[PDB]
Design an enzyme around this catalytic site. Structure first.
Site, PDB file in Angstrom:
ATOM      1  N   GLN A  35      30.025  35.331  33.816  1.00 28.43           N
ATOM      2  CA  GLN A  35      30.858  35.502  34.999  1.00 28.43           C
ATOM      3  C   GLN A  35      30.419  34.678  36.200  1.00 28.43           C
ATOM      4  OE1 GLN A  35      30.972  40.118  34.865  1.00 28.43           O
ATOM      5  NE2 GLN A  35      32.995  39.526  35.639  1.00 28.43           N
ATOM      6  N   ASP A  71      20.066  44.676  40.592  1.00 25.64           N
ATOM      7  CA  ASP A  71      21.275  45.028  41.327  1.00 25.64           C
ATOM      8  C   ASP A  71      21.972  43.791  41.877  1.00 25.64           C
ATOM      9  OD1 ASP A  71      21.434  48.153  41.561  1.00 25.64           O
ATOM     10  OD2 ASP A  71      19.321  47.671  41.921  1.00 25.64           O
ATOM     11  N   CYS A 101      29.024  45.978  28.945  1.00 25.86           N
ATOM     12  CA  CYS A 101      28.473  46.255  30.262  1.00 25.86           C
ATOM     13  C   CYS A 101      29.530  47.051  31.016  1.00 25.86           C
ATOM     14  CB  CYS A 101      28.082  44.961  30.984  1.00 25.86           C
ATOM     15  SG  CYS A 101      29.191  43.557  30.703  1.00 25.86           S
ATOM     16  N   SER A 102      29.907  46.631  32.221  1.00 23.06           N
ATOM     17  CA  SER A 102      31.026  47.305  32.875  1.00 23.06           C
ATOM     18  C   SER A 102      32.359  46.686  32.452  1.00 23.06           C
ATOM     19  CB  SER A 102      30.863  47.274  34.398  1.00 23.06           C
ATOM     20  OG  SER A 102      31.809  48.132  35.016  1.00 23.06           O
ATOM     21  N   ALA A 103      32.510  45.377  32.641  1.00 21.49           N
ATOM     22  CA  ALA A 103      33.712  44.677  32.207  1.00 21.49           C
ATOM     23  C   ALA A 103      33.600  44.120  30.792  1.00 21.49           C
ATOM     24  CB  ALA A 103      34.040  43.541  33.180  1.00 21.49           C
ATOM     25  N   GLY A 104      32.386  43.968  30.270  1.00 20.86           N
ATOM     26  CA  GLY A 104      32.214  43.473  28.920  1.00 20.86           C
ATOM     27  C   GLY A 104      32.367  41.979  28.758  1.00 20.86           C
ATOM     28  N   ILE A 105      32.015  41.192  29.777  1.00 23.84           N
ATOM     29  CA  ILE A 105      32.147  39.739  29.700  1.00 23.84           C
ATOM     30  C   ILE A 105      30.920  39.042  30.280  1.00 23.84           C
ATOM     31  CG2 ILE A 105      34.673  39.667  29.638  1.00 23.84           C
ATOM     32  CD1 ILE A 105      34.603  39.163  32.674  1.00 23.84           C
ATOM     33  N   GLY A 106      30.290  39.655  31.280  1.00 27.20           N
ATOM     34  CA  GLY A 106      29.190  39.011  31.974  1.00 27.20           C
ATOM     35  C   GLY A 106      27.866  39.123  31.248  1.00 27.20           C
ATOM     36  N   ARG A 107      27.165  40.241  31.458  1.00 26.67           N
ATOM     37  CA  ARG A 107      25.935  40.493  30.714  1.00 26.67           C
ATOM     38  C   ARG A 107      26.201  40.542  29.213  1.00 26.67           C
ATOM     39  NH1 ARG A 107      24.379  45.408  34.644  1.00 26.67           N
ATOM     40  NH2 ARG A 107      26.671  45.283  34.709  1.00 26.67           N
ATOM     41  N   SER A 108      27.342  41.111  28.813  1.00 30.98           N
ATOM     42  CA  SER A 108      27.695  41.163  27.397  1.00 30.98           C
ATOM     43  C   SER A 108      27.841  39.766  26.811  1.00 30.98           C
ATOM     44  CB  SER A 108      28.985  41.957  27.207  1.00 30.98           C
ATOM     45  OG  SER A 108      28.814  43.301  27.606  1.00 30.98           O
TER      46      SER A 108
HETATM   47 CL   LIG Z   1      23.550  52.141  42.496  1.00 36.68          CL
HETATM   48 CL   LIG Z   2      29.841  44.159  34.362  1.00 42.07          CL
END
Ligand SMILES: [Cl-]
Ligand SMILES: [Cl-]
Ligand SMILES: [Cl-]
Ligand SMILES: [Cl-]
Ligand SMILES: [Cl-]
Ligand SMILES: [Cl-]
Length: 280
Positions: A261, A180, A214-221
């Site tokens: 990111q 998290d 991922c959520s935005a598709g730039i960090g973990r992705s």
């Molecule tokens: Cl959560």
């Molecule tokens: Cl993300």
């Protein structure tokens, strides 16, 4: 060699400075289509957009826009599609992209709820007996099987083009244990997940590009594709010490903005490549 550089950056604490150089040197290309007023509700984040030159275009005539970018790594001979976590109104667009690009695998690096809020729509069916219809793009999606592990989960999905009744098997790889706060302390489970995606054959040149999000598709992705490409380059080059993670990341940023990111994600990327090379 890369490990020697890694410890030198760690000892001097230069990760923030190196990461800021990457942000400064990164390519700047227009995202005109993404910024059109009619596409405001197709973007999850106003500050994360696909470049016009590398964006994935839907094959429909009305609005071909989806927040997704094609990353083509020429020397490594791998292609990826990096996209945002689908919105409730772009789940049909998402699976339309998977069909038209002939993707075999979908890699999900986030949970539907993170940081106490929604980060991604429930775009795949959780129950076999409750399939999903996307009426706007005329596709049916059925959960075929689900194999849950402590860190990840592999699902077999059946995607059907209702116009032609063609069906395809899509493999869905869900990494569920990204912390998290911050980045994992060890790259072991992230590398195990990457090697699992590799082992499935979803990254093969026989298939269309894998869809990563991922959520935005730039960090973990970005971390996922950067590590995979660097490991490919270390195995193919005669001098594997010549792989410069910073150069590879800048090359990838020609195709999608903002990959990696944080400075912690940059350090984690180095760590994952170093440890991934040792295991390979
Ligand atoms: Cl959560
Ligand atoms: Cl993300
Ligand atoms: Cl989830
Ligand atoms: Cl959502
Ligand atoms: Cl390089
Ligand atoms: Cl950035």
């Amino acid at each position: 060699e890369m490990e020697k550089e890694f410890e030198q950056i760690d000892k001097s604490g230069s990760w923030a400075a190196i990461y800021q150089d990457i942000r400064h040197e990164a390519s700047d290309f227009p995202c005109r289509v993404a910024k059109l007023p009619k596409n405001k509700n197709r973007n999850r984040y106003r500050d994360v957009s696909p470049f016009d030159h590398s964006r994935i275009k839907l094959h429909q005539e009305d609005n071909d826009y989806i927040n997704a970018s094609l990353i083509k790594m020429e020397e490594a001979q791998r292609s990826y599609i990096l996209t945002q976590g689908p919105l409730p109104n772009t789940c049909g667009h998402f699976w339309e992209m998977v069909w038209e690009q002939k993707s075999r695998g979908v890699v999900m690096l986030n949970r539907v709820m993170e940081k106490g809020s929604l980060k991604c729509a429930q775009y795949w069916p959780q129950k076999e007996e409750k399939e999903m219809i996307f009426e706007d793009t005329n596709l049916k999606l059925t959960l075929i099987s689900e194999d849950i592990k402590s860190a990840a989960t592999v699902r077999q999905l059946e995607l059907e083009n209702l116009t032609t009744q063609e069906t395809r098997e899509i493999l869905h790889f869900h990494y569920t244990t990204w912390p998290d706060f911050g980045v994992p302390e060890s790259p072991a489970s992230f590398l195990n997940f990457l090697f699992k995606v590799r082992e499935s054959g979803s990254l093969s040149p026989e298939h269309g590009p894998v869809v990563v999000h991922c959520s935005a598709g730039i960090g973990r992705s970005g971390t996922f594709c950067l590590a995979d490409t660097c490991l490919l380059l270390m195995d193919k080059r005669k001098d594997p010490s010549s792989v410069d993670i910073k150069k590879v990341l800048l090359e990838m940023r020609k195709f999608r903005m903002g990959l990696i990111q944080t400075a912690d994600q940059l350090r984690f990327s180095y760590l994952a490549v170093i440890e991934g090379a040792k295991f390979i």
